[PDB]
Amino acid sequence: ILVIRKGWLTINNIGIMKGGSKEYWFVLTAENLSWYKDDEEKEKKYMLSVDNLKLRDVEKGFMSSKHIFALFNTEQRNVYKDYRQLELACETQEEVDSWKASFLRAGVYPERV
């Protein structure tokens, strides 16, 4: 119910078949993490349950300046659609760190990297 945070994040590993890496507007609550095309909320890319979401430091990553972390379904292959893991990136390390605390509150805890 309570909104924990609203803020932009880049989904770095969105397929060829979905435009590629685009920025999406995230809304996290104690029950769901939903992502939209933008802050107007006219869209809905999807609403994924926070249940069974965990967070891992995804092993160095691409050869970029991005700091990577990811949400992954602990009990199955894909996290949503045909994805394996949903990669989230920030231009700065502090951005990644503040968002980790917001996920903590919603019940997505770290480890299993």
| 92 to 12, 50, 88: CA distances (angstroms) | 15, 25, 12
CB of 88 closer than 8 Å to CB of 102: no
111 torsion bin: left (phi>0), alpha (psi -120 to 50), beta (else): left
Amino acid (one-letter) located at 75? E
CB of 96 closer than 8 Å to CB of 103: no
Query: Collapsing DSSP states into helix, strand and coil, what is residue 9?
Result: strand
